[PDB]
Design a binder for this molecule. Structure first.
Ligand SMILES: [Mg+2]
Ligand SMILES: [Mg+2]
Ligand SMILES: [Mg+2]
Ligand SMILES: [Mg+2]
Ligand SMILES: [Mg+2]
Ligand SMILES: [Mg+2]
Ligand SMILES: [Mg+2]
Ligand SMILES: [Mg+2]
Ligand SMILES: [Mg+2]
Ligand SMILES: [Mg+2]
Ligand SMILES: [Mg+2]
Ligand SMILES: [Mg+2]
Ligand SMILES: [Mg+2]
Ligand SMILES: [Mg+2]
Ligand SMILES: [Mg+2]
Ligand SMILES: [Mg+2]
Ligand SMILES: [Mg+2]
Ligand SMILES: [Mg+2]
Ligand SMILES: [Mg+2]
Ligand SMILES: [Mg+2]
Ligand SMILES: [Mg+2]
Ligand SMILES: [Mg+2]
Ligand SMILES: [Mg+2]
Ligand SMILES: [Mg+2]
Ligand SMILES: [Mg+2]
Ligand SMILES: [Mg+2]
Ligand SMILES: [Mg+2]
Ligand SMILES: [Mg+2]
Ligand SMILES: [Mg+2]
Ligand SMILES: [Mg+2]
Ligand SMILES: [Mg+2]
Ligand SMILES: [Mg+2]
Ligand SMILES: [Mg+2]
Ligand SMILES: [Mg+2]
Ligand SMILES: [Mg+2]
Ligand SMILES: [Mg+2]
Ligand SMILES: [Mg+2]
Ligand SMILES: [Mg+2]
Ligand SMILES: [Mg+2]
Ligand SMILES: [Mg+2]
Ligand SMILES: [Mg+2]
Ligand SMILES: [Mg+2]
Ligand SMILES: [Mg+2]
Ligand SMILES: [Mg+2]
Ligand SMILES: [Mg+2]
Ligand SMILES: [Mg+2]
Ligand SMILES: [Mg+2]
Ligand SMILES: [Mg+2]
Ligand SMILES: [Mg+2]
Ligand SMILES: [Mg+2]
Ligand SMILES: [Mg+2]
Ligand SMILES: [Mg+2]
Ligand SMILES: [Mg+2]
Ligand SMILES: [Mg+2]
Ligand SMILES: [Mg+2]
Ligand SMILES: [Mg+2]
Ligand SMILES: [Mg+2]
Ligand SMILES: [Mg+2]
Ligand SMILES: [Mg+2]
Ligand SMILES: [Mg+2]
Ligand SMILES: [Mg+2]
Ligand SMILES: [Mg+2]
Ligand SMILES: [Mg+2]
Ligand SMILES: [Mg+2]
Ligand SMILES: [Mg+2]
Ligand SMILES: [Mg+2]
Ligand SMILES: [Mg+2]
Ligand SMILES: [Mg+2]
Ligand SMILES: [Mg+2]
Ligand SMILES: [Mg+2]
Ligand SMILES: [Mg+2]
Ligand SMILES: [Mg+2]
Ligand SMILES: [Mg+2]
Ligand SMILES: [Mg+2]
Ligand SMILES: [Mg+2]
Ligand SMILES: [Mg+2]
Ligand SMILES: [Mg+2]
Ligand SMILES: [Mg+2]
Ligand SMILES: [Mg+2]
Ligand SMILES: [Mg+2]
Ligand SMILES: [Mg+2]
Ligand SMILES: [Mg+2]
Ligand SMILES: [Mg+2]
Ligand SMILES: [Mg+2]
Ligand SMILES: [Mg+2]
Ligand SMILES: [Mg+2]
Ligand SMILES: [Mg+2]
Ligand SMILES: [Mg+2]
Ligand SMILES: [Mg+2]
Ligand SMILES: [Mg+2]
Ligand SMILES: [Mg+2]
Ligand SMILES: [Mg+2]
Ligand SMILES: [Mg+2]
Ligand SMILES: [Mg+2]
Ligand SMILES: [Mg+2]
Ligand SMILES: [Mg+2]
Ligand SMILES: [Mg+2]
Ligand SMILES: [Mg+2]
Ligand SMILES: [Mg+2]
Ligand SMILES: [Mg+2]
Ligand SMILES: [Mg+2]
Ligand SMILES: [Mg+2]
Ligand SMILES: [Mg+2]
Ligand SMILES: [Mg+2]
Ligand SMILES: [Mg+2]
Ligand SMILES: [Mg+2]
Ligand SMILES: [Mg+2]
Ligand SMILES: [Mg+2]
Ligand SMILES: [Mg+2]
Ligand SMILES: [Mg+2]
Ligand SMILES: [Mg+2]
Ligand SMILES: [Mg+2]
Ligand SMILES: [Mg+2]
Ligand SMILES: [Mg+2]
Ligand SMILES: [Mg+2]
Ligand SMILES: [Mg+2]
Ligand SMILES: [Mg+2]
Ligand SMILES: [Mg+2]
Ligand SMILES: [Mg+2]
Ligand SMILES: [Mg+2]
Ligand SMILES: [Mg+2]
Ligand SMILES: [Mg+2]
Ligand SMILES: [Mg+2]
Ligand SMILES: [Mg+2]
Ligand SMILES: [Mg+2]
Ligand SMILES: [Mg+2]
Ligand SMILES: [Mg+2]
Ligand SMILES: [Mg+2]
Ligand SMILES: [Mg+2]
Ligand SMILES: [Mg+2]
Ligand SMILES: [Mg+2]
Ligand SMILES: [Mg+2]
Ligand SMILES: [Mg+2]
Ligand SMILES: [Mg+2]
Ligand SMILES: [Mg+2]
Ligand SMILES: [Mg+2]
Ligand SMILES: [Mg+2]
Ligand SMILES: [Mg+2]
Ligand SMILES: [Mg+2]
Ligand SMILES: [Mg+2]
Ligand SMILES: [Mg+2]
Ligand SMILES: [Mg+2]
Ligand SMILES: [Mg+2]
Ligand SMILES: [Mg+2]
Ligand SMILES: [Mg+2]
Ligand SMILES: [Mg+2]
Ligand SMILES: [Mg+2]
Ligand SMILES: [Mg+2]
Ligand SMILES: [Mg+2]
Ligand SMILES: [Mg+2]
Ligand SMILES: [Mg+2]
Ligand SMILES: [Mg+2]
Ligand SMILES: [Mg+2]
Ligand SMILES: [Mg+2]
Ligand SMILES: [Mg+2]
Ligand SMILES: [Mg+2]
Ligand SMILES: [Mg+2]
Ligand SMILES: [Mg+2]
Ligand SMILES: [Mg+2]
Ligand SMILES: [Mg+2]
Ligand SMILES: [Mg+2]
Ligand SMILES: [Mg+2]
Ligand SMILES: [Mg+2]
Ligand SMILES: [Mg+2]
Ligand SMILES: [Mg+2]
Ligand SMILES: [Mg+2]
Ligand SMILES: [Mg+2]
Ligand SMILES: [Mg+2]
Ligand SMILES: [Mg+2]
Ligand SMILES: [Mg+2]
Ligand SMILES: [Mg+2]
Ligand SMILES: [Mg+2]
Ligand SMILES: [Mg+2]
Ligand SMILES: [Mg+2]
Ligand SMILES: [Mg+2]
Ligand SMILES: [Mg+2]
Ligand SMILES: [Mg+2]
Ligand SMILES: [Mg+2]
Ligand SMILES: [Mg+2]
Ligand SMILES: [Mg+2]
Ligand SMILES: [Mg+2]
Ligand SMILES: [Mg+2]
Ligand SMILES: [Mg+2]
Ligand SMILES: [Mg+2]
Ligand SMILES: [Mg+2]
Ligand SMILES: [Mg+2]
Ligand SMILES: [Mg+2]
Ligand SMILES: [Mg+2]
Ligand SMILES: [Mg+2]
Ligand SMILES: [Mg+2]
Ligand SMILES: [Mg+2]
Ligand SMILES: [Mg+2]
Ligand SMILES: [Mg+2]
Ligand SMILES: [Mg+2]
Ligand SMILES: [Mg+2]
Ligand SMILES: [Mg+2]
Ligand SMILES: [Mg+2]
Ligand SMILES: [Mg+2]
Ligand SMILES: [Mg+2]
Ligand SMILES: [Mg+2]
Ligand SMILES: [Mg+2]
Ligand SMILES: [Mg+2]
Ligand SMILES: [Mg+2]
Ligand SMILES: [Mg+2]
Ligand SMILES: [Mg+2]
Ligand SMILES: [Mg+2]
Ligand SMILES: [Mg+2]
Ligand SMILES: [Mg+2]
Ligand SMILES: [Mg+2]
Ligand SMILES: [Mg+2]
Ligand SMILES: [Mg+2]
Ligand SMILES: [Mg+2]
Ligand SMILES: [Mg+2]
Ligand SMILES: [Mg+2]
Ligand SMILES: [Mg+2]
Ligand SMILES: [Mg+2]
Ligand SMILES: [Mg+2]
Ligand SMILES: [Mg+2]
Ligand SMILES: [Mg+2]
Ligand SMILES: [Mg+2]
Ligand SMILES: [Mg+2]
Ligand SMILES: [Mg+2]
Ligand SMILES: [Mg+2]
Ligand SMILES: [Mg+2]
Ligand SMILES: [Mg+2]
Ligand SMILES: [Mg+2]
Lengths: 189, 110, 59, 77, 141, 72
RNA sequence: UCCCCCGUGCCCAUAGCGGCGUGGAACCACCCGUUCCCAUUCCGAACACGGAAGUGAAACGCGCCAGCGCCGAUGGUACUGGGCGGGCGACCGCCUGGGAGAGUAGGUCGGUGCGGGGGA
RNA sequence: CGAUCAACGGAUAAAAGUUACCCCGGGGAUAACAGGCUGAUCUCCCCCGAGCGUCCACAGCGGCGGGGAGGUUUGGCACCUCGAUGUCGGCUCGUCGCAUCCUGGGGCUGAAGAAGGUCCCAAGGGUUGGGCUGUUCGCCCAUUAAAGCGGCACGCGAGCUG
RNA sequence: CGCCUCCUAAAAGGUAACGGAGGCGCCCAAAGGUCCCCUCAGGCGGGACGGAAAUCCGCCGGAGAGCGCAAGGGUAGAAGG
RNA sequence: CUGACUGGGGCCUGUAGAGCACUGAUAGGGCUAGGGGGCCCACCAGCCUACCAAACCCUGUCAAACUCCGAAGGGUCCCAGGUGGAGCCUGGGAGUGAGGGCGCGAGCGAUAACGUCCGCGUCCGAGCGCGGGAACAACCGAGACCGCCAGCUAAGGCCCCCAAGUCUGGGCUAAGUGGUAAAGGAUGUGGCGCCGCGAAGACAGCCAGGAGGUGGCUUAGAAGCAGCCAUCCUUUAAAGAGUGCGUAAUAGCUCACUGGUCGAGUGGCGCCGCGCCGAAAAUGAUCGGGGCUUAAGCCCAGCGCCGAAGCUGCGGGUCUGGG
C-alpha cells in the first residue's frame, strides 16, 4: 500500500566505498530540492521489489524529515545485474506523471484455444495526483482471441487519472503458441 | 521556409557586405521610401533620410530623388563619401534608382 | 615552500618522456636528492615521475 | 585466388594550418579543406579549391556562428 | 536460420569483445531470460539449436523471444591455402554477445518449464549462462 | 553421404613425385559400408583436393547404383 | 531613459510547428489602376509604375497555450591520460587525475544593438 | 606537337623460349625431408538428452548444438640445419606408450545356459604362414587365444638391401 | 604495378599487408565569365487521352533533390534551374 | 637559452564510450499497401485470416567503410620553468637502409603459431656485463671507470641444498590441491545473508490407512502411467481422477497425504571462500631437488633480516667544468 525506507545524507564519500559497505548510493530531487542520499541495499531491495516505481516510498531522513517519493530511475550494473544507483522523486501536491500497474483480469478465449497472452505493457504512464494514486487498473482480456489486441484507448480509467501515452499504444496481444509441428517446415526452409 | 523576397534580399546584401564599404540600405513601402547608411562592422546607422521624415509629398519617383539628395547632404556633413548601394529585394529601377541617382547628385561616391 | 625529491626507482624501461622529466628535475642517479622550489612547472614534472620518486615538503 | 582491391589514393594532408592566436603573414594558408567546412571571415580569402588564406598580416581568430557555419578571421596587428 | 536479408558490405573486420553489454541487459518481453555470463561470437546454428531445444521442451504452447541476431559475417579461408591472397570467404554469421546480455526470453509457460527449457538451451551455447526472472528492476528500465 | 558409413584410408601415393611422395601421404580411399562401393583418388598432390574428388565420386556411385536398383 | 510600429543587425530553435486571441489613428500590408517606366518562356501572380475608395480576410506585428519540435541538470555509470595488479587466454580488476552518451528533474511559445516614425 | 615510355621516376631507337647435358657465386635471408611452434584438418574422449530401442531417454544407441585431450594425418608458419640433418618400402635388431587384439580381474546387460554386447581395472607375456603389388596400406587364401593401434629423425642405409 | 575516393588509421599530420569496397586515362564553346531572376526531392487531394511515374492545380516540405561520371566533403543566405 | 620534458591559456580533432537523427541491418507487436489462401462471384463488386508481408508506429537491438552525440588524450601557437653529451646554423667523416621479443592499439589469420603487417612504447640488438626468475638475448631488479676480507637497499627471498624468521596475529585447504586444462557432475568443507516447518509436536525412522463416480478428443481393445483438452467431487482424518513394477488385460508394492509414535531443532534459497571429479602418449622419474599438512600451501594484517657491478663509505684514474 505505502512503504517506508530509511535514507541518509551523503557528501564526499566515494560511491564505491558506500557500495562495498552495502549502501546503495542515490539522489532525491524535484524542482525545489536536490540532495545526495544513500539507502541500505538489502533494506531498499525488500521495499523496491514490492513498491517498484508504482507505489509511494516515504524516506525517513536522519534530520527528522519524511518525504514521499516515487522511484524515478534505477541504474543497473550491466555485468553483475545489480542496482548501483537510485533516483528518488520527491512528490508534492501537484499532479505527476507516473506508471500505474495494469492488472489483466480474465482468461482470454485465445488462451483457451492454446494461445499466449503477451502482456506488452505491465503498467501505463499517467498523470494523477499523489493523493490519488490507484493501486492497479483492471483490464478485461477474456474477449481476446488469437490474435486480437488491446490498446490504451480501451483502458477504463479511475477518477482523476489521465492517460499520458497515446491511446494508439497497444497494451496486450494474444499470440499463437510455439509448436513442434512447425519445426520440420522451418528446418527444410 | 524562406520566400523569394527573403532569398533575393539575403543574396544581394551578402554580396554587398563582403566588400566592407559603408552600406546604403533603401526601404521602399507602397507610400514612402527610406534610406539609412549602415556600418555593418559596428552594427550602427550613421545617417538617415526618408520621405516620411522630410514630409515629402508628390510623385513617388521625384520624391525618392529628393530623399536621396537629402541623405547625401547630411552624409557629406559627417565625412561619409564612399558607400555601397543596397537595393535589397528591389530591382535597380524606378523609385530605388531615383533615390540612388539623387544620392549620387549630392556627391555620394558609388 | 620547497620540495625534496629523491629518485628511488630506476627509469630504465620507462618511456623517454619520463626520462626527460627526471632530466628537467636534475635527477641523474638513484638515491639522489634535489631540493626544488615548489612551482607548478616543477610540480608537474615531479608528479609525472611520482612512481619513481619520493617527495617531501621542506621549510 | 586473388584480390580485386588493393587501391588507395595518396593522403591529401588536409586540415587547419594555422590555429587561433597564431601570427600569420598575408598569403599564409590557414585551412586546406574540401568544400566549406570553414568559411572565410574578415581579411580571409578563399581559393578555387576552398583553401582559406590570410589577406593581411595579423592574428588568426576562429568563430562558430551556429547555422551560419564556422568562420576564420584574421585580426590586423 | 537467422542471417541478414541483405547487407551493405559482405565482410566485416573481427573487432573486439571488451566490456559488458551495451544494452539488452534487462528482461523486456517474457517472464524468464537467459543471460550471457561470458563474451563470445554466438553462431546462427547455436542460436537455432537453443531455439529448437526450447520449442521441443514446450511441445506446444509458450512463446520464445530471441533477442540477439547474427548480423556479423564469419570468414574462413579455404582449407590448405597459405596466408595472403585476400580475405577468406563468408562461412556463417554470428551475433556478438557480451556479459549481461539477455539472449532469450520465454513466456506463457510455468516456472518449472521455463527453468528447464532455458537450462537445456544454455547447454547448446559456447558460454556460461544464468537464468533470470522478470523483476521490478527490469520493469523500471 | 552419411559419414557414419565411411571408412577413410589415408596412405602414401604411388609413382612420380619427390621426397614429398615418399614422406607426405595424401593417398585417399573411401569405403561406403552399406553398399560396399569403394573409391580411391590419387591425382593431385594434397589429400584434401584428393578427398574432395573421392567424396563426390563415392556419391556418384551410390546414386548410379540406387538408380540401377530402381529402374530394374 | 518608457510603450507601439518601421527599417537594419547580433545571439543561432529556450528563437521553431501548431492552436487561439489581438492590432489599422500611425506605420506596414493587402488594396485601387495598368496611362507612363518596367515586366510575364502565358498571366500586372511576380517584377514595376501611378494612386488612396476600402480591409486588417491574407501576410506581417504583438500576446497567450507545452500537443510536437528545441533546450536540459544534479546524481550514477561507460570510457580513459598517468600509475599498478590478475588471467593460459577471450579478457578482469585497483589507485590517481579527467569524464560522457542515453535517461530523469526541469526549461522554452525568444533575448538584445543601432537608426527612424509615433505615443507619454 | 609526337608517350597504354600503363613495369605509369620512364635501363636500348630496336628483343622470346628451353636445359634431366648443364656451370659458377651465394642463401637455411627461401622451398622439398626430419625436427620445432600451432592444432585448422586428423584420431580419441567427454557435455546436452531430441528421438530410437514392442513397453522403457541412457542394455545398446545419441538429432541439432556445446567443451576438451592427443600430437600418429594433411596443412599453416619459415625458427636450427643448403662450407649437406641421405629421402619410400623391405630386412635385421629392438625399446617404449596404452586410447587393450588375445590372455587375467570386474560392473551393467534387452546376462536362462553356452556365446555375445558395453564399460571399468590391467602393458606380464603373446600377437602365425601364404597369394597380389616396389609398396606402407589394402584385398584375398588357410589358420588362430588373438591375428592391437601408435612413438622412437612416420626408430634403425659410418647395419644390409635398393 | 600510375592516379582518385572511403575504411582499416589508434579524434592533428602521416602510417603497412596478395587487408575491405569503388572509380580514372574523360569530359563542356558552355557544362566557361558576369549581371538578373527562380527553388528541390517526396507525400496527400484534385485533374481528358494518361498508366506507379508525361504535363496541370492545391496543400503539406530545410533539404532526403540537384550539382556531367566513383566516393567523400560541401552546397538552396547556391555551388543547383 | 632558443632544447627534450613541464605549468597556464587559446584553437584544431571525430577515436573509446555511447546513440539510432541519417545510411543500412534487425527480432517481436501494432497499424496498414500489395500480393497469398479461403468465401460468394464472375453482374463487379462483396466478405476471412493464426500465410507472406512495404511504408509507418511501439517495444528491443546491431555497424570499420552509420553519427543526433562524444570523452580521456593528442597536436599546434603564445608566455613562463627548464644550462642539458640540450638546441639552432655552416661545413668534414660516417655507418645503417635483414631487425627481434615484450606491453598496449588494430588489420590479416582460426578471438592458431617462437605467425604475419602497421601504430605507440620499451628492451635486446650494441647491456650473451651484474641480482632475481632452477637453468634462459629482450619478464622483474638495475645502466658495470679501477681497488676494499666495510655499510644500506632493489626485485626476489629468509626449513635444508642456499645468505636471511622453522618470526608474530587471525582465517581457509586435506586435495601433496599447492606444483599445469574445459563443459559438466557431487551430502568434500567453510562463511555471510534471507525465507519455510516446528506442543490443533516438526524433519528422519518405525505403525495404521491411503478409498469411492472408477469413463473422455477415445483409440491398437491402456478410468489411472497410449498420445491429448480434461481437472468436476464425494463416503461426518477426509486419501492425486496419480512420480518409480503388470500392462495394445487385472493384480500388487510406493509416495504426496492423515493419524499413531518418541522430544529436539530441522529443511530451502541466495552471494562469497577453498578444495574433489572430468584428466590418456610414447628412454627414468621429480614442485629445481630434498622434503613440506594449525605448512615449508593459500588469503589477510605486521615487525625484522638476507640480498646486485644499484646507493653509501674510503682510496685512485681520466676527461669536462668551476675556482
Ligand atoms: Mg540482492
Ligand atoms: Mg624501474
Ligand atoms: Mg638510472
Ligand atoms: Mg624494469
Ligand atoms: Mg609516459
Ligand atoms: Mg607526450
Ligand atoms: Mg644510478
Ligand atoms: Mg621511497
Ligand atoms: Mg583481381
Ligand atoms: Mg586494399
Ligand atoms: Mg594502385
Ligand atoms: Mg596509403
Ligand atoms: Mg600518402
Ligand atoms: Mg587517402
Ligand atoms: Mg583541422
Ligand atoms: Mg572580427
Ligand atoms: Mg582569387
Ligand atoms: Mg572552382
Ligand atoms: Mg574567441
Ligand atoms: Mg583481426
Ligand atoms: Mg567461433
Ligand atoms: Mg574469421
Ligand atoms: Mg598449400
Ligand atoms: Mg588474407
Ligand atoms: Mg578469413
Ligand atoms: Mg559458422
Ligand atoms: Mg551483447
Ligand atoms: Mg554452456
Ligand atoms: Mg533504454
Ligand atoms: Mg609405379
Ligand atoms: Mg610432407
Ligand atoms: Mg610427414
Ligand atoms: Mg523591426
Ligand atoms: Mg504560432
Ligand atoms: Mg481582428
Ligand atoms: Mg495572427
Ligand atoms: Mg488603414
Ligand atoms: Mg478604420
Ligand atoms: Mg501617361
Ligand atoms: Mg496588380
Ligand atoms: Mg508589388
Ligand atoms: Mg486608391
Ligand atoms: Mg488577420
Ligand atoms: Mg512580406
Ligand atoms: Mg509557460
Ligand atoms: Mg541528456
Ligand atoms: Mg555527471
Ligand atoms: Mg592504462
Ligand atoms: Mg588485450
Ligand atoms: Mg578513475
Ligand atoms: Mg576523479
Ligand atoms: Mg562520451
Ligand atoms: Mg548528459
Ligand atoms: Mg516555443
Ligand atoms: Mg530583432
Ligand atoms: Mg551588435
Ligand atoms: Mg528603438
Ligand atoms: Mg523612437
Ligand atoms: Mg615518342
Ligand atoms: Mg589497369
Ligand atoms: Mg618499373
Ligand atoms: Mg619498360
Ligand atoms: Mg602516368
Ligand atoms: Mg616505377
Ligand atoms: Mg611517385
Ligand atoms: Mg633513358
Ligand atoms: Mg629510352
Ligand atoms: Mg627512333
Ligand atoms: Mg623491353
Ligand atoms: Mg638463354
Ligand atoms: Mg631431357
Ligand atoms: Mg625430360
Ligand atoms: Mg632423357
Ligand atoms: Mg647427355
Ligand atoms: Mg654429357
Ligand atoms: Mg640427350
Ligand atoms: Mg655445361
Ligand atoms: Mg654451386
Ligand atoms: Mg657472381
Ligand atoms: Mg658457391
Ligand atoms: Mg628452415
Ligand atoms: Mg627475400
Ligand atoms: Mg623449409
Ligand atoms: Mg627445408
Ligand atoms: Mg620441408
Ligand atoms: Mg611441407
Ligand atoms: Mg629424418
Ligand atoms: Mg617441414
Ligand atoms: Mg633438426
Ligand atoms: Mg625431436
Ligand atoms: Mg608443438
Ligand atoms: Mg587439440
Ligand atoms: Mg592442443
Ligand atoms: Mg580440431
Ligand atoms: Mg575427455
Ligand atoms: Mg545425460
Ligand atoms: Mg518409442
Ligand atoms: Mg529401459
Ligand atoms: Mg522420448
Ligand atoms: Mg554426433
Ligand atoms: Mg571446440
Ligand atoms: Mg609431432
Ligand atoms: Mg608429426
Ligand atoms: Mg607445412
Ligand atoms: Mg608438421
Ligand atoms: Mg608452408
Ligand atoms: Mg624454414
Ligand atoms: Mg629459416
Ligand atoms: Mg619473419
Ligand atoms: Mg640443407
Ligand atoms: Mg664441412
Ligand atoms: Mg659442417
Ligand atoms: Mg659435409
Ligand atoms: Mg656430415
Ligand atoms: Mg614398435
Ligand atoms: Mg586403460
Ligand atoms: Mg581381457
Ligand atoms: Mg574376460
Ligand atoms: Mg538372450
Ligand atoms: Mg540366450
Ligand atoms: Mg554367460
Ligand atoms: Mg563383460
Ligand atoms: Mg564400467
Ligand atoms: Mg567401473
Ligand atoms: Mg601387456
Ligand atoms: Mg613392456
Ligand atoms: Mg604389446
Ligand atoms: Mg600377414
Ligand atoms: Mg607364384
Ligand atoms: Mg609378398
Ligand atoms: Mg603388400
Ligand atoms: Mg611379385
Ligand atoms: Mg594400396
Ligand atoms: Mg579392392
Ligand atoms: Mg578357431
Ligand atoms: Mg576367446
Ligand atoms: Mg610425418
Ligand atoms: Mg613411428
Ligand atoms: Mg615405418
Ligand atoms: Mg625413417
Ligand atoms: Mg631409415
Ligand atoms: Mg648405403
Ligand atoms: Mg632405406
Ligand atoms: Mg645411421
Ligand atoms: Mg652415417
Ligand atoms: Mg651407423
Ligand atoms: Mg650417422
Ligand atoms: Mg631391396
Ligand atoms: Mg633404382
Ligand atoms: Mg588516416
Ligand atoms: Mg583517419
Ligand atoms: Mg589521423
Ligand atoms: Mg592519433
Ligand atoms: Mg580497376
Ligand atoms: Mg547560357
Ligand atoms: Mg550566363
Ligand atoms: Mg511536389
Ligand atoms: Mg495524382
Ligand atoms: Mg485519368
Ligand atoms: Mg497523374
Ligand atoms: Mg544531395
Ligand atoms: Mg558513375
Ligand atoms: Mg631558458
Ligand atoms: Mg618552443
Ligand atoms: Mg617547447
Ligand atoms: Mg605544455
Ligand atoms: Mg564502439
Ligand atoms: Mg538507425
Ligand atoms: Mg529510441
Ligand atoms: Mg562495436
Ligand atoms: Mg556501436
Ligand atoms: Mg571508422
Ligand atoms: Mg565508429
Ligand atoms: Mg549533447
Ligand atoms: Mg583536448
Ligand atoms: Mg594546449
Ligand atoms: Mg624559458
Ligand atoms: Mg653548450
Ligand atoms: Mg648524447
Ligand atoms: Mg646528442
Ligand atoms: Mg672526420
Ligand atoms: Mg674520416
Ligand atoms: Mg646499409
Ligand atoms: Mg650508405
Ligand atoms: Mg633495401
Ligand atoms: Mg628480416
Ligand atoms: Mg627493410
Ligand atoms: Mg618492423
Ligand atoms: Mg619487415
Ligand atoms: Mg607485442
Ligand atoms: Mg597489463
Ligand atoms: Mg588496422
Ligand atoms: Mg615474429
Ligand atoms: Mg603473438
Ligand atoms: Mg597477433
Ligand atoms: Mg619493437
Ligand atoms: Mg647486427
Ligand atoms: Mg637489460
Ligand atoms: Mg640499450
Ligand atoms: Mg641481459
Ligand atoms: Mg644474456
Ligand atoms: Mg651469471
Ligand atoms: Mg638474467
Ligand atoms: Mg638467473
Ligand atoms: Mg639461481
Ligand atoms: Mg634469460
Ligand atoms: Mg656508467
Ligand atoms: Mg641490511
Ligand atoms: Mg627458494
Ligand atoms: Mg642458512
Ligand atoms: Mg615473511
Ligand atoms: Mg610459524
Ligand atoms: Mg604436489
Ligand atoms: Mg600436481
Ligand atoms: Mg565452473
Ligand atoms: Mg491404484
Ligand atoms: Mg487419460
Ligand atoms: Mg561451495
Ligand atoms: Mg582433475
Ligand atoms: Mg586425480
Ligand atoms: Mg597462522
Ligand atoms: Mg649487498
Ligand atoms: Mg656505480
Ligand atoms: Mg672518490
Ligand atoms: Mg672523477
Ligand atoms: Mg667527458
Amino acid at each position: 500500500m505505502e512503504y517506508r525506507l530509511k535514507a541518509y545524507y551523503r557528501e564526499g564519500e566515494k560511491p564505491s566505498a558506500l557500495r562495498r559497505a552495502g549502501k546503495l548510493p542515490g539522489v532525491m530531487y524535484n524542482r525545489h530540492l536536490n540532495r545526495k542520499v544513500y539507502v541500505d541495499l538489502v533494506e531498499f531491495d525488500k521495499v523496491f521489489r514490492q513498491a517498484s516505481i508504482h507505489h509511494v516510498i516515504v524516506l525517513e531522513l536522519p534530520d527528522g524529515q519524511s518525504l514521499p517519493t516515487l522511484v524515478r530511475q534505477v541504474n543497473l550494473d550491466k555485468r553483475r545485474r545489480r542496482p548501483e544507483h537510485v533516483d528518488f522523486f520527491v512528490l508534492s501536491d501537484e499532479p505527476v506523471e507516473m506508471y500505474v500497474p495494469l492488472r489483466f483480469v480474465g482468461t482470454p478465449a485465445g488462451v483457451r484455444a492454446g494461445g499466449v497472452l503477451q502482456e506488452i505493457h505491465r503498467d501505463i504512464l499517467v498523470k494523477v495526483s499523489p493523493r490519488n494514486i490507484p493501486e492497479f487498473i483492471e483490464v478485461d482480456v477474456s474477449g481476446l482471441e488469437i490474435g486480437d489486441s488491446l490498446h490504451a484507448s480501451d483502458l477504463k480509467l479511475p477518477p482523476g487519472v489521465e492517460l499520458a501515452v497515446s491511446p494508439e499504444e497497444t497494451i496486450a496481444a494474444v499470440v499463437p503458441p510455439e509448436d513442434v509441428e512447425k519445426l520440420a517446415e522451418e528446418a527444410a526452409a | 521556409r524562406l520566400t523569394a523576397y527573403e532569398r533575393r534580399k539575403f543574396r544581394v546584401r551578402n554580396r554587398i557586405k563582403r566588400t566592407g564599404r559603408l552600406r546604403l540600405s533603401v526601404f521602399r513601402s507602397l507610400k514612402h521610401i527610406y534610406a539609412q547608411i549602415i556600418d555593418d562592422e559596428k552594427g550602427v546607422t550613421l545617417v538617415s533620410a526618408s520621405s516620411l521624415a522630410l514630409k515629402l509629398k508628390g510623385n513617388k519617383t521625384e520624391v525618392a530623388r529628393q530623399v536621396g539628395r537629402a541623405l547625401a547632404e547630411k552624409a557629406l556633413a559627417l565625412g561619409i563619401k564612399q558607400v555601397a548601394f543596397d537595393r535589397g529585394p528591389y530591382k535597380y529601377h524606378g523609385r530605388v534608382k531615383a533615390l540612388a541617382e539623387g544620392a549620387r547628385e549630392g556627391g555620394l561616391e558609388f | 615552500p620547497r620540495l625534496k625529491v629523491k629518485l628511488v626507482k630506476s627509469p630504465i624501461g620507462y618511456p623517454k618522456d619520463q626520462k626527460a622529466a627526471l632530466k628537467a628535475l636534475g635527477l641523474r642517479r638513484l638515491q639522489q636528492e634535489r631540493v626544488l622550489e615548489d612551482t607548478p612547472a616543477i610540480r608537474g614534472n615531479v608528479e609525472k615521475v611520482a612512481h619513481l620518486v619520493r617527495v617531501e615538503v621542506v621549510e | 585466388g586473388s584480390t580485386r582491391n588493393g587501391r588507395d589514393s595518396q593522403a591529401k594532408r588536409l586540415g587547419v594550418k594555422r590555429y587561433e592566436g597564431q601570427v600569420v603573414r598575408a598569403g599564409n594558408i590557414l585551412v586546406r579543406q574540401r568544400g566549406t567546412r570553414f568559411k572565410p571571415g574578415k581579411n580571409v580569402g578563399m581559393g578555387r579549391d576552398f583553401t582559406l588564406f590570410a589577406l593581411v598580416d595579423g592574428v588568426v581568430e576562429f568563430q562558430d556562428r551556429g547555422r551560419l557555419g564556422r568562420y576564420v578571421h584574421v585580426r590586423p596587428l | 536460420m537467422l542471417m541478414p536479408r541483405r547487407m551493405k558490405y559482405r565482410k566485416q573486420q573481427r573487432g573486439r569483445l571488451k566490456g559488458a553489454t551495451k544494452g539488452g541487459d534487462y528482461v523486456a518481453f517474457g517472464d524468464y531470460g537467459l543471460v550471457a555470463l561470458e563474451p563470445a561470437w554466438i553462431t546462427a546454428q547455436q542460436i537455432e539449436a537453443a531455439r529448437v531445444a526450447m520449442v521441443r521442451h514446450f511441445r506446444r504452447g509458450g512463446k520464445i523471444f530471441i533477442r540477439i541476431f547474427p548480423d556479423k559475417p564469419y570468414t574462413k579461408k579455404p582449407l590448405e591455402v597459405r596466408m595472403g591472397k585476400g580475405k577468406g570467404n563468408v562461412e556463417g554469421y554470428v551475433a556478438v554477445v557480451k556479459p549481461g546480455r539477455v539472449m532469450f526470453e520465454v513466456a506463457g509457460v510455468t516456472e518449472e518449464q521455463a527453468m528447464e527449457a532455458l537450462r537445456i538451451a544454455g547447454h547448446k551455447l559456447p558460454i556460461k549462462t544464468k537464468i533470470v526472472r522478470r523483476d521490478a528492476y527490469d520493469e523500471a528500465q | 553421404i552419411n559419414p557414419a558409413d565411411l571408412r577413410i584410408d589415408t596412405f602414401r601415393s604411388s609413382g612420380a613425385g619427390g621426397q614429398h611422395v615418399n614422406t607426405t601421404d595424401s593417398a585417399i580411399r573411401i569405403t561406403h559400408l552399406p553398399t560396399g562401393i569403394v573409391v580411391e583418388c590419387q591425382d593431385e598432390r594434397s589429400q584434401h583436393k584428393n578427398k574432395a574428388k573421392a567424396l563426390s565420386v563415392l556419391g556418384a556411385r551410390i546414386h548410379a547404383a540406387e538408380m540401377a536398383k530402381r529402374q530394374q
